[model samples]
Target chain A: KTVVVTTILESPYVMMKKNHEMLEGNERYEGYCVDLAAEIAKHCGFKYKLTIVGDGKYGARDADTKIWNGMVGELVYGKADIAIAPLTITLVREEVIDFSKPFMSLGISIMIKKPQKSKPLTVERMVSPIESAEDLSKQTEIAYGTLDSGSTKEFFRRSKIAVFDKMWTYMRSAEPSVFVRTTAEGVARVRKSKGKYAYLLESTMNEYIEQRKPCDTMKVGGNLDSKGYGIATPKGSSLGTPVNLAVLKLSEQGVLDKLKNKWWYDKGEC
Target chain B: KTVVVTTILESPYVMMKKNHEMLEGNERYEGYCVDLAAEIAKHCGFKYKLTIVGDGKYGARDADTKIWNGMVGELVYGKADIAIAPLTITLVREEVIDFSKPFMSLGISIMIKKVSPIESAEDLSKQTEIAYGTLDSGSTKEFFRRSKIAVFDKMWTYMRSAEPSVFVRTTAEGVARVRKSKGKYAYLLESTMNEYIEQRKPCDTMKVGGNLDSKGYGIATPKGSSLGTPVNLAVLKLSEQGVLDKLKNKWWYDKGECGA
Candidate 1:
């Protein structure tokens, strides 16, 4: 059977090749998730076609329409057979789908621009060294922030820990608001803020940015919480068992670790 | 020539051997640095004596007496030819003495009672629910005192005034404080020591959050000493051959009681 593998077009995960305009089919794209899809399909003894999630989202439910969107939606409404990407495993998503054991583990982390040297009297001089989320909370001179819309925001909103709870409340109401609409915008804000802004997102993405050009950002401190990304499928999909076994076998053989190093480090520019 | 090596008695670094009463000289102690000393000596071809610093301090200058103390001081006063323990390399110390390229890289880390609600230094700093501190006269304490960063400065402000005093005389005392605080205290120290303790018996303490700053501990020598060049080369050679990593595993993970 030709499996319909749904994934998002995210950098180093699933992306168009430089020659994508002239290429066709799976040859048109390549990335971490693209390579992952090939490996899993080969191990499971099935042929598959890679399809980008239509909505260009990981997945979330619409508030009023009550409709699922992104890769989760594709799996639920039978648009795709599997989601082989950095689709985070969450409780709400699990209600309608099955997830293979986590393929990658990560947690939310604070990302900041590398401090720059400047005249001794400016913002750089006063911009405090941020060490942790708690550090972000105690100061107002520089604004630290997170994505306004996404699972990351949800993680903070529902958090019960005192520090996270306080942070969430502060972010929700801070004048001029600290929330950005997307991760890229957040990263850009940090880059342009001249040591006056910070962005909080998953450590995986943070580490990725740390290795990219103009490498002015760093993933400081440890993750705030622990979670993982898994191969998600429609609830009770027959492929679930085989896919889980394949991931486990590959993990045991260290293939996953090698792939991570290949994509995250081998090509690392910074 | 007999090289006088100054060291301090710290767990897993250098410690009095259980059989010290029966053993003599170098045989009287065993630890990561003791083992490290042997390797460096073999490579450098030197006879040496490992002398414990009299004050039991890592190395700091006394504010009032106008004298350097600890392992760094021992080297400066010509009492010791080398200091080979977990002595941090700071700019201030480097001006008076020399340091080889770092053999081990570490950073300031938070040590907490396991299962504590706190997750990071900020978590401890924002609330008075738990008190945190560093060694009384160590690099970690100096970091906080010298920091111009707002967060660290704020933290320093709190710690210097924290009731009952947050500073401890030794790393062991700090660890003990965390273990007995019932989740009310945290100790900031080098990540290397925190990780070592986490793997020991009880396993009731954990190094949480990422490090606050990055630095390393270097084997030190008096400025312009001939031993400096050969010692630095020997360290590089061992590091390239993975000897340093092997030593860490031998001391930290070989008999580790915790399941890390």
Candidate 2:
């Protein structure tokens, strides 16, 4: 059976490339989810059709109704076999659907994002950028985090410094977990989020990524979601097992991370 | 209304003391959650039943129901009001459940077989029927993954694929795997959990482990429950009174059965 994959239109996740007039079908798209689904299919050993969710809603329950909608509804109503997007792993949605194993914790500053610039330093600047630990806790937007483990996580966890302590509490409980797994993932998100995301770091890794690739364009710092953007399936879909394993195997083997960079960075010929 | 307190029998956490097999109801239980629940209720001003989870699991989602099982399932389906056990606070659980501010911090360590000869880190590496892995993504795994030490470096890679996979989701699950596998599988978990298990009845394991990492277990409730606030406050106040430490001693050491 051809797997019916449902996703949504979103930047870096599913941007409408709309292929050449000569190209068509699933080939008409390219973005994070497009590439991720392709890699997942290879490992799970399946080729499938890609279709955006009809409603374009992420998924929410009505206050008084017998319905749930969004990409989630597609899986619930048997319209799609699977879903893979930036769909968050949440409690209310979990009771009716399934997600792969997800366990990531976000702590504190590990690192920053680099902006795409057509000119030297003509990059878009963040508004009212945070300057101190206190500012970070005060503002709600612009999420920040450090490497998921080691002295950086340990440092803030044990520190009693007021600003650092407040941040430790924020980072620890930040839902959708605000921690990154590696330096590359952190930096890519920085460059990927435009100025919406920030990264903190151990002084060394900080400047290291700040000077990556073309040096001048290289940059900064961010935590992250504890809920992995997992491949979603109908409650008991058999493909769930293989796809789940594929995601993990793909991640550990660097296949997943490579695709992350591939879709986000590509040849940079933009 | 008696609050439903769901937990598992993982030693000093929920032991079967059978007030003489004659006693019935939760009165037959006394251990970590057993006593901690008392103080918890004392402060929150409620009485709760100390029920052991029917399925000997910490928690996992059923492929059929898409619902969780163990104490977590109890909380998820409204079968139980709260989960007061050594339940870990991972994001997966966070999505489906609510947790108290942390009440305990467990560091990774090894739960060795009563069948000796598997004492050293090197020993765990070369033996057959003796698979090993630490709490995934935490300090123990990171220790080996980040260590410059020669022996541990080998271990980190050995686990990079030491066979049919060795990591477990919960410390309780890890201990359960090690227990059922007999001497075949050894779990690398936190020192607190390992030592407590070593002292319970049918003591089949030993703690031979670290400050290698930090992970916490919190009393959990269904998300947005009114109890979440009071219980959260109680956990902090209990910590303030040193009642948390006293209970730790009460269950883990004062009542330990394997010292001899």
Candidate 3:
């Protein structure tokens, strides 16, 4: 009879209003996931409670310790009926929960600060077809966000999967040390590096960060692989089917791209 | 010293000689890679020889014995200076060898038999975006061919990389499977499937390929530890210098799309 959906507080995806105390339900704060949750709830006919994940960490299980954390924790502990965050569809994550059909396709990308001076550069120049050592020479530093023993970091450090394996090579062999840290630190490094450091992350977050003030960044290079964001739920949860259907409907109508651009390109807190 | 280049006998890249007696370079075969090799030689200022890998394995490091095998072997064994074959630039292959910036981009696509109904990849693209592996599980069926594996067996065993793990043995087996399944099953394949399949007639199941652009087919050399760095950088210079695109446009205008 009651439906509780767990989400996170990533800015623009799900942020508390500077005045969340002044609103309720759908009116409290609006962002991409909020709109998606509303539509999914409408289609599923569930009256849901939108609350922050208990620990605000994407719940992943510790292999030996067997403890759950993050959004996965909410589902594992029966704390939420569904999760609609920017959760990536990865094998290790898939083992712990069921993800509906992905609603957004993405991959890891590096966002570099735009060159201070504009020049007429072709896409071909950006990704040269004829690559040489001098052509491979790059001036920017490649740095990655670190995970404190989380799946994202583990993707590179202990990759057994295809996508992560590719990502690992890109990070490790990429000239400058691929410094790993939290998303915040990575962004801070890029903002402060004066175009010396390129921050790598899932493209969705890269786009989100590119829009912020002094937003001195733009995604470069093709992604390591193509993946999508999905609404995750515990096994046998009733919401999976509708969430999947909702994704399809949105894609067909171009609403998914619309939502991504709306949140990613526009709507910044001034 | 002659720098060796690997090539295949596919039309456009190479063709059978009229005499069929003996094979010689430039005289016996000519196509995209022929011209590309010449251009590379000119740009890199190296004298090279065209040498075949003698087998059609794309490339792989044996998971078990941990030995490098396939066309990649030619380079590892110091037999060839570069592989100008239409080899795909996959992550696994990349770890061992370096690829020039992709001169071509092809999506993973499927081909169905004639009279089969499905037309577009949209239905398939929408079908869960499963984590499908590359063609031949990781490119090249020589490993399958050497094992005396049938098309269907190879399809079943190798296509396990398919999220659904659907099976289609040869390109033809896949086309046949799609016809037999009555659209209940569709084939997962590459865009080259789209082009080459079109050349052959009557058996016309269309391609529902999706682009994954992780990287594409490129000219390859040994890894950073070897001469690949200089060769790769040469190609990068062409890319940066606009010579690569000029070649692409020339080839595109001369012949619809060059395949080597």
Displacement of the residue B95 alpha carbon in candidate 3, Å: 42
Candidate 3: residue A80 Cα off by (Å): 1.1
The TM-score of candidate 2 is 0.42
- TM-score to native of every candidate shown: 0.52, 0.42, 0.47
Compared with the true structure, what per-residue lDDT tens digits does model 1 show for residues B1-260? Answer: 69989999987989898868889888898999998899999999999998999987888778778688888888888989998899886656766787775677777899887744667777778878778898977887877887766788899999888787889988998899889998888889999999999999899988888877656778999988999867876776575445776788899888898866
How well is each residue in A1-270 modelled by candidate 3, as lDDT tens digits?
868888877766787666779788767767888988887876667788788865556656777988877787668668787888877755556656766656666665666666554345343223312122111123223344444434455555564544445555666675555564356667777778776665557777877787677666677766644455678989777776566666645543446656777887767633
Comparing 1 and 2 by DockQ, which wins? 2
Model 2 steric clash total: 32
True contacts kept of 1: 0.00
lDDT of 3 at B260: 32
User: Which docking class does model 3 fall in?
Assistant: incorrect
> Positional deviation of B165 in candidate 3, in angstroms?
36
Regions more than 4 Å wrong, model 1: A1-270
lDDT of 2 at B139: 35
Compute the interface RMSD for each candidate structure: 23.9, 12.1, 18.0
- What lDDT is reached at residue A65 by model 3? 81
Question: How many clashing pairs in candidate 3?
Answer: 23
Task: Tell the DockQ for candidate 1.
Answer: 0.01
As a whole number from 0 to 100, the lDDT of residue A187 in candidate 3 is 78
The top-ranked prediction according to TM-score is: 1
A1-270 in candidate 2: lDDT tens per residue?
688889876555676775536777777788768878888887777878888876665666655885877787768888888888766544445556776533112223333343443443567554335555666778888787755643355455655656667878888888777677654566677767766666665432344334345432233233311122446777877876666566545544445545655654554442
lDDT scores in order: 0.80, 0.66, 0.59
